[PDB]
Design a protein around this ligand. Structure first.
Ligand SMILES: CCCCCCCCCCCCCCCCCC(=O)O[C@H](COC(=O)CCCCCCCCCCCCCCC)COP(=O)(O)OCC[N+](C)(C)C
Ligand SMILES: CCCCCCCCCCCCCCCCCC(=O)O[C@H](COC(=O)CCCCCCCCCCCCCCC)COP(=O)(O)OCC[N+](C)(C)C
Ligand SMILES: *[C@@H]1O[C@H](CO)[C@@H](O[C@@H]2O[C@H](CO)[C@@H](O[C@@H]3O[C@H](CO)[C@@H](O)[C@H](O)[C@@H]3O)[C@H](O)[C@H]2NC(C)=O)[C@H](O)[C@H]1NC(C)=O
Ligand code: BEF
Ligand SMILES: [Mg+2]
Lengths: 1172, 362
């Protein structure tokens, strides 16, 4: 409950000093950011310490800082942990600084705030001066101009138009492609200039910010001038401009600011940007626990075996070492336990979370920098915004797409029409449902439509003022023929009733509308059409192109340039389109052919096809019933192509019956019976007997490769559920145009009927809200199951059942209430081949994603543009925003940002499928690579009684995971490709190993732990069994028997066998990774060739001269690299011959030239692609 | 503009190979590796079998040997000679008590008379072997001073207070004279006086000469440098106090640059068996004859049941006689040749096509 006062001091509810108001409204700033700059450092460190090895390294610094165990340099061992935490936090701040530069664009975009004093301000003329977006405060008076976005929730005061009406574009709040009418308040309706609003004092008693887009409650109280009295005036939702909206077709609109910041409805239907730890990143903690168990076993074995040595008797420790105390240790396996914890600490490596994060950051850099995800029109590359979830894009099973702006292009095109049962209109929209049988060689028809447009433009050259070009003419039909005129005679008009029907049809499309007229400031001789719905903008523009140029409106009627001459039609009545009516009707006046007569009146009704065929005349003797089979055949043929259809029906009236109808129309107009049903019956009484002129068909244009992108994703096993903000029948037409509804499906429409939500009472019995649970069960006999979803999440098929769910949003609110109905709603949606959820709130888009993500254990995608999609983007696992000409919240809150929808195939099937397989391979390669080295510190414990001496010289332990082995793992995680980027799109079924999760298992991890355990037996005991007989391994008898020299034998076997293990588990041996596998193989010989020439080696002083010149080194080296690599190179060769994966078979075809006839960078979702 | 740079690195279009493991390429990779590793291991076992060696353990010479020439029991000695594989003429051994030593734990002289039926070649190595002496515990192997190895008059706080490697149990004696070769490694240096010749029993002026030079690497004289302490500053180690009864004079401070038997002991053995070179002859063949070793016994081993011996050999380029490398190359061939055979005979009788085993289009 807030009470916003304006131009008046506050009451005594200003008890807070140092800043007079108490309530402390938020500032009009968007965040879209993971971290605020204050708590970046506490929250990012805990995000790094939710990884379990990072609290393992912190314990080793605490325990290593005690002199009981004798850790050398206890302050230098903290340096590797501290610099990794700093580098990861600098990376996360640079990642988070790029979300703040989009905040500064949004918080600085120049609104117009009145320069009057605002008494709801913090502490720490009268023009509409240009101020910033962040400067908007609660209680400001903002003038919003034409075509710019709205800064906050604005209770609308005045408009440029008289009687105070706006038009807002709610395709940002909703999917509603039509402009919504917003009325200003009738109290402050005459307030026009800046000097008028400064002298007006009022206040608004409002309610709380309650996150519902379709509801608002408020009161305006203003003390009356010349009569001291309070005057309430109610405020509802159509008096309110919300933050996502954009003011259209209005010069200015003035209003009060009420909700700023997180109080607005687009912020309350969203949240803080989550940090989104990936699934491979989340399941990496369990693999570290497998190492915490293996570390515990090795330290427990060494802790008990050391104490068994320390209570022996005949040992050389008693004589030559000065541990002569035969007692003092019965079980000192506590101090010898944790010496081995320091000794074996490199079994969980420090380079784990810095290697996998250089991978994720550099995988985001290659998504950012490719030209095939670049949008040349917006000048916009793909922008990764979360730099750590590129591997989540390779496991995606469910896509939760928005429709408007995401699947569609927000461009309507008049494509087809029926005039007297003749199909007029040519369009190759989605005749590519036939890719099963006939070719995609029909680019010849797209030129055959193209020459027919130019031949129609050269044929329509009669005297037309605004036959501008073909650039505004989107109706190609060369059958525009005015046939058997100007050929035989001059008068004519004996035959060709179809020509009289064509020119009266297009006249009715230039009469029955609410399209206004404004002059284009570029080329003011050509004016353009400022409509409310873009359907009626396309109907008036296509009648303008064929000859009937609507050129203005008078107070008597319409000026229509009927092929040169501007015949005047006197408008008599206008019946406005409504949601309950589904019809717009216009009464025009036929002129007089007999002098001295008042002529007739023509009713022209347009509206939806399903309710105009009810309103047609059944008592006829003309062709008013034989053409009803032909037109209704066409409108079924048009709707299954995905076009909005609209019948055009008429009836001529006698002018005395019309005056009898006008006599009742003025009854329902002088009274305030518009909320009552009095006016809608008077309009209903005239709209009963109608003659059908025909119908229209308008294409809601998709984006460029939308039905091609959905076709590739469905072949990859990925399921598309369109979650829609606007009407049911709109998304069904977009379902048919995106090939999601197929014309043989059974649409399982839920369609609740009662206006009762399960919120209060009706516990023992119901009669009006058991419907939804009923036909969820009824549709669960054609899908013959009841509730078993444990069996369902073992299934990842498409399915093959030709059903489709259409739920209406209000029925989605009741199918997401209890546990047993969520289980039946999920099981029906999982079993259907298309799911459409319409009229869906931003809360319920996030609710459907969270239902599928929590019940099934799956990976979700949720692409969208618009602030109704932000909660869906944030509550999914990945979130994609589609970028536009403007700055969008769904782009700023997203994880990736692509310019067009068709880039989602290149993003998911190429980059995500790579980044999944790059990281599902590298992580088992990484724990293999460490434990082949760290376990030889355990196997050396057998031969020094687990006392705790090091096998390795101290520069081998530093530089193993830093220099000698670190680079082949990293260039596997960045640059590995199972197949080419074209083959990832030619064969989308290679994506299915990520949905089935066949590449990253905890079972796969254990075999790499068992292949790592095996080769450390090879890497230790092969140098052991050349020393074990007589300790002489050099050709000159001088002795390499030092333990650091045995560690050179072990390390060089371990480094070469690792870096050739990583090489054999790369597909695509390129020259870049091949060079830096070799330089990692040659930096182990180079460092000890340099460090063992210095006197600072201190026991190691000529190690590379003595060991590398020994022939027994180069004999152990080749036989031990064999036995390390031989059990895995044999298992893979047995696997690749007898149980091959799909991606091994596709690579076999690609070597045999099954893919060489595709260009590099072949994009199947491209309209301008070449021929294959 | 904002179009990204197209240079085939940023577009991930580097030149590559894409290896596909077909059995026409993988099965000849096994046969090449198998043929290589059975020729290598066949030549290793041929050169390893020709390595002769003499191993005589003498730790029981004070008690199990008398003042007359008796045979060594076969528990202690091992001979390997490839031209005489049935060689069993046991070496004899004799103990001279030396009652003026007054140590009584290990004193006197053990005189070992072995017989070699074949001649060892030009470079002859006389090693000493030690068993059950553990030179690889974590306190032992860090107990020395790196400053004193490099010939520096280090202080007390640089031999005792160093960070990782320090003379921590053995730094200075009671009055305060710091031990010059300090720590447990230099203190417990192997004592037994081996001779500078092999006495040819049965001949005179034909004694096979040995030397204590060329016993370590020549490059270790860049690190082991002559000390700069005076005689006042340093004392001998507490178990060297019998070789130096009066302590350090101005003449007897040992130059560790030229004393290579010390330089071998300061390199501790990695494992339980320790083998360090102590006599060498690079000049002459050791002919086939009966020779005599005269070991001054000073090094106690029997209080930890450890063995103590001698390893007379001429090694190979692989060093020593160890049958491991030749066997394990022959195992690496016979495995790579067997699993070339198993995968091939599974291929002619199973096997598939290289085109359409894909689970997408079944
Ligand atoms: C404690 C001591 C600290 C000392 C200093 C530490 C190191 C600081 C280094 C200096 C800062 C380096 C900043 C590198 C930025 C790279 C990212 C980048 O350029 O763009 C990024 C590209 O983002 C992506 O989508 C690709 C992923 C980024 C990959 C590279 C990340 C590099 C920075 C993070 C790691 C740096 C190393 C840190 C070591 C400590 C943002 O895109 P944008 O379109 O929003 O950018 C604006 C583009 N224009 C201007 C054309 C509109
Ligand atoms: C082919 C020539 C190669 C030359 C060298 C190239 C190096 C390239 C490194 C790329 C990143 C991969 C490595 C990340 C850091 C690994 C840190 C590491 O493991 O080394 C540490 C070394 O510790 C130190 O004192 C040095 C700290 C250096 C920290 C370096 C961080 C590097 C971050 C790089 C970020 C930008 C990357 C740019 C693209 C590659 C030892 O840990 P360990 O597990 O190996 O051994 C523990 C046992 N004790 C305690 C006894 C030492
Ligand atoms: C290496 O050689 C020395 C002598 O050549 C061996 O004898 C060690 O001699 C020292 C001094 O002669 C002994 O120290 C003394 O021990 C007795 C009895 O504990 C004590 O009464 C004295 O005050 C002094 O501490 C030392 O004990 C003795 N070594 C042993 C193991 O008994 C030496 O044994 C040879 N080996 C080593 C590993 O140094
Ligand atoms: F118009 Be939207 F929310 F893609
Ligand atoms: Mg939408």
């Amino acid at each position: 409950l807030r009470t916003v006062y304006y131009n008046m001091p506050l009451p005594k509810d200003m008890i807070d000093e140092e800043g007079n108001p108490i309530m402390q409204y938020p500032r009009n700033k968007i965040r879209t950011t993971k971290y605020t700059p204050l708590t970046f450092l506490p929250k990012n460190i805990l995000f790094q310490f939710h990884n379990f090895a990072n609290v393992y390294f912190l314990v080793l610094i605490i325990l290593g800082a005690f002199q009981i165990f004798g850790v050398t340099n206890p302050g230098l061992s903290a340096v590797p942990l501290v610099v990794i935490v700093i580098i990861t936090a600098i990376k996360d701040a640079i990642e988070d600084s790029r979300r703040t530069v989009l905040d500064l664009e949004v918080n600085n975009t120049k609104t117009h705030i009145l320069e009057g004093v605002e008494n709801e301000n913090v502490s720490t003329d009268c023009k509409f001066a240009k101020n910033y977006w962040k400067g908007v405060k609660v209680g400001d008076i903002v003038r919003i101009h034409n075509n710019d976005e709205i800064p906050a929730d604005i209770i609308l005061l005045s408009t440029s138009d008289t009687d105070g009406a706006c038009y807002v574009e709610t395709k940002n709040l909703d999917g509603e492609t039509n402009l919504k009418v917003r009325q200003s308040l009738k109290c402050t309706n005459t307030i026009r200039t800046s000097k008028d609003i400064a002298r007006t004092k009022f206040w608004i008693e409002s309610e709380g910010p309650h996150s519902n887009l379709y509801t608002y409650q408020g009161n305006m109280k203003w003390r009356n001038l010349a009569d001291g009295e309070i005057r309430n005036e109610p405020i509802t939702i159509n008096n309110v401009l919300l933050r996502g909206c954009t003011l259209r077709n209005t010069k200015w609109a003035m209003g009060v600011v009420m909700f700023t910041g997180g109080d607005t409805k687009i912020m309350l239907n969203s949240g803080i940007t989550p940090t989104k730890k990936s699934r491979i990143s989340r399941e990496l903690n369990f693999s570290v626990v497998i190492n915490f168990v293996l570390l515990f076993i090795l330290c427990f074995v060494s802790g008990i075996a050391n104490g068994v040595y320390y209570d022996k008797k005949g040992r050389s420790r008693f004589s030559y070492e000065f541990g002569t105390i035969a007692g003092s240790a019965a079980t000192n396996g506590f101090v010898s336990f944790w010496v081995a914890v320091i000794l074996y600490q490199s079994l969980v490596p420090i380079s784990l979370y810095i290697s996998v994060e250089i991978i994720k950051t550099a995988q985001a850099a290659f998504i950012y920098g490719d030209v095939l995800l670049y949008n040349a029109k917006l000048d916009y590359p793909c922008t990764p915004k979360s730099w750590n979830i590129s591997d989540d894009l390779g496991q995606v099973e469910y896509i939760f797409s928005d429709k408007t702006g995401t699947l569609t292009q927000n461009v309507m095109e008049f494509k087809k029409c029926t005039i007297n049962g003749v199909s007029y209109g040519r369009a190759y929209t989605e005749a590519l449902a036939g890719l099963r049988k006939r070719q995609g060689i029909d680019v010849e028809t797209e030129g055959r439509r193209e020459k027919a447009e130019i031949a129609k433009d050269r044929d329509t050259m009669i005297d037309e003022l605004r036959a501008l070009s073909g650039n505004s003419q989107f109706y190609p039909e060369e059958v525009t023929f005015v046939s058997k005129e100007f050929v035989r005679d001059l008068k004519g008009a004996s035959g060709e009733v179809q020509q009289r029907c064509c020119e009266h049809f297009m006249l009715a499309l230039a009469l029955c509308h609410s399209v206004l007229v404004e002059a284009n400031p570029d080329n003011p001789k050509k004016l353009d059409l400022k409509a409310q719905s873009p359907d009626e903008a396309a109907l008036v523009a296509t009648a303008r192109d064929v000859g009937f140029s609507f050129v203005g409106k008078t107070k008597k009627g319409l000026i229509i340039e009927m092929q040169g001459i501007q015949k005047e039609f006197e408008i008599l009545n206008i019946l406005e389109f409504n949601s309950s009516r589904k019809r717009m009707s216009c009464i025009v006046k036929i002129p007089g052919l007999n002098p001295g007569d008042e002529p007739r009146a023509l009713l022209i009704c347009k509206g939806a096809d399903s309710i105009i065929y009810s309103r047609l005349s059944r008592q006829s003797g003309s062709n008013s019933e034989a053409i009803l089979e032909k037109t209704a055949l066409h409108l079924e043929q048009y709707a299954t192509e995905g076009l909005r259809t609209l019948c055009i029906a008429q009836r001529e009236l006698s002018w005395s019956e019309y005056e009898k109808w006008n006599e009742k129309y003025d009854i329902a107009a002088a009274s305030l019976a518009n909320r009552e049903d009095e006016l809608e019956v008077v309009a209903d009484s005239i709209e009963r007997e109608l003659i059908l002129l025909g119908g229209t068909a308008i294409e809601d244009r998709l984006q460029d490769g939308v039905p091609d992108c959905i076709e590739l994703l469905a072949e990859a096993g990925i399921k598309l559920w369109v979650l829609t903000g606007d009407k049911v029948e709109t998304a069904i037409n977009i379902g048919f145009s995106c090939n999601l509804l197929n014309n043989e499906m059974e649409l399982l429409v839920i369609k609740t009927t009662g206006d009762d939500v399960k919120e209060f009472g009706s516990e023992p019995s119901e009669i009006v809200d058991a419907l939804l649970s009923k036909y969820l069960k009824e549709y669960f006999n054609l899908t013959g199951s009841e509730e078993e979803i444990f069996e369902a999440k073992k299934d990842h098929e498409f399915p093959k059942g030709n059903y489709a769910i259409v739920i209406d949003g209000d029925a989605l609110k009741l199918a997401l209430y209890g546990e047993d109905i969520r289980r039946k709603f999920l099981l029906l949606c999982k079993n259907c081949r298309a799911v459409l959820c319409c009229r869906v709130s931003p809360s319920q888009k996030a609710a459907v994603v969270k239902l599928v993500k929590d019940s099934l254990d799956v990976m979700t995608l949720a692409i969208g543009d618009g602030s109704n999609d932000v909660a869906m983007i944030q509550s999914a696992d990945v979130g994609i925003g589609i970028a536009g000409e403007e700055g969008r919240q769904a782009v700023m809150c997203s994880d990736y940002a692509i310019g067009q929808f068709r880039y989602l195939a290149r993003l998911v099937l190429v980059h995500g499928r790579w980044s999944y397989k790059r990281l599902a391979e590298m992580i088992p390669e990484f724990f293999y690579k460490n434990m082949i080295f760290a376990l030889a510190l355990f196997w050396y414990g057998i031969y020094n009684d687990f006392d705790g001496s090091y096998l390795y010289e101290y520069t081998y332990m530093m530089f193993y995971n830093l220099a000698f082995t670190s680079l082949p793992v990293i260039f596997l995680g960045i640059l590995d490709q199972d197949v080419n980027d074209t083959i990832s799109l030619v064969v989308p079924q290679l994506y299915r190993v990520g949905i089935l999760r066949k590449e990253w298992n905890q079972r796969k991890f254990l075999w790499y732990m068992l292949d790592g355990l095996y080769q450390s037996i090879i890497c230790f005991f092969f140098p052991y069994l050349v020393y074990h007989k007589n300790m002489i391994v050099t050709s000159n008898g001088l002795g390499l028997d030092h333990r650091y020299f045995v560690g050179v034998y072990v390390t060089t076997i371990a480094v070469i066998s690792c870096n050739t293990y990583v090489l054999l588990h790369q597909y695509r041996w390129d020259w870049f990774s091949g060079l830096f596998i070799a330089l990692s193989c040659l930096v182990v010989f180079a460092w000890t060739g340099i460090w063992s020439s210095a006197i600072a080696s201190r026991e190691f002083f000529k190690a590379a001269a003595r060991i590398y010149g020994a022939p027994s080194f180069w004999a152990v080296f080749f036989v031990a690299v064999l036995f390390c690599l031989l059990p895995r190179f044999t298992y893979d060769s047995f696997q690749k011959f007898f149980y091959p994966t799909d991606v091994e078979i596709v690579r076999e075809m690609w070597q045999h030239g099954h893919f060489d006839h595709y260009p590099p960078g072949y994009d199947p979702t491209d309209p301008n692609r070449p021929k294959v | 503009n904002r179009r990204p740079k197209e240079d085939a690195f940023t577009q991930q279009r580097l030149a590559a190979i894409n290896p596909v493991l077909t059995p026409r390429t993988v099965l000849p990779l096994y046969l090449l590796i198998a043929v290589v590793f059975v020729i290598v291991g066949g030549c290793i076992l041929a050169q390893n079998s020709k390595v002769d060696e003499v191993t005589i353990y003498y730790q029981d010479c004070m008690t199990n040997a008398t003042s007359s020439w008796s045979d060594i029991p076969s528990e202690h000695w091992q001979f390997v000679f490839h031209k005489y594989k049935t060689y069993n003429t046991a070496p004899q051994w004799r103990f001279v008590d030396d009652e003026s030593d007054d140590f009584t734990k290990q004193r006197g002289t053990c005189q070992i008379r072995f017989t070699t039926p074949s001649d060892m070649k030009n470079n002859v190595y006389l090693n000493y072997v030690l068993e059950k002496f553990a030179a690889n515990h974590r306190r032992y192997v860090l107990s020395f001073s790196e400053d004193q190895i490099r010939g520096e008059d280090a202080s007390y706080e640089t031999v005792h207070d160093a960070t990782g490697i320090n003379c921590k149990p053995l730094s200075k004696n009671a009055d305060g004279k710091i031990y010059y070769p300090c720590g447990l490694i230099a203190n417990s240096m192997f004592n037994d006086t081996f001779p500078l010749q092999l006495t040819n029993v049965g001949d005179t002026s034909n004694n096979y000469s040995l030397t204590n030079k060329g016993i370590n690497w020549e490059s270790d004289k860049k690190r082991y440098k002559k000390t700069k302490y005076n005689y006042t500053q340093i004392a001998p180690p507490p178990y060297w106090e019998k070789m130096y009864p009066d302590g350090y004079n101005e003449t007897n401070i040992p130059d560790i640059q030229d004393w290579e038997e010390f330089q071998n002991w300061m390199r501790p053995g990695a494992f339980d068996k320790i083998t360090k070179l102590i006599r060498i002859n690079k000049n002459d063949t050791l002919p086939a004859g009966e020779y005599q070793l005269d070991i001054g016994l000073h090094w106690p081993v029997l209080e930890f049941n450890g063995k103590k011996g001698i390893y007379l050999t001429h090694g190979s380029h692989l060093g020593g006689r160890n049958p491991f490398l030749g066997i394990v190359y022959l195992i690496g061939g016979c495995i790579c040749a067997a699993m070339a055979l198993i995968l091939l005979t599974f291929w002619l009788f199973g096997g598939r096509k290289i085109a359409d085993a894909s689970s997408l289009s079944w």
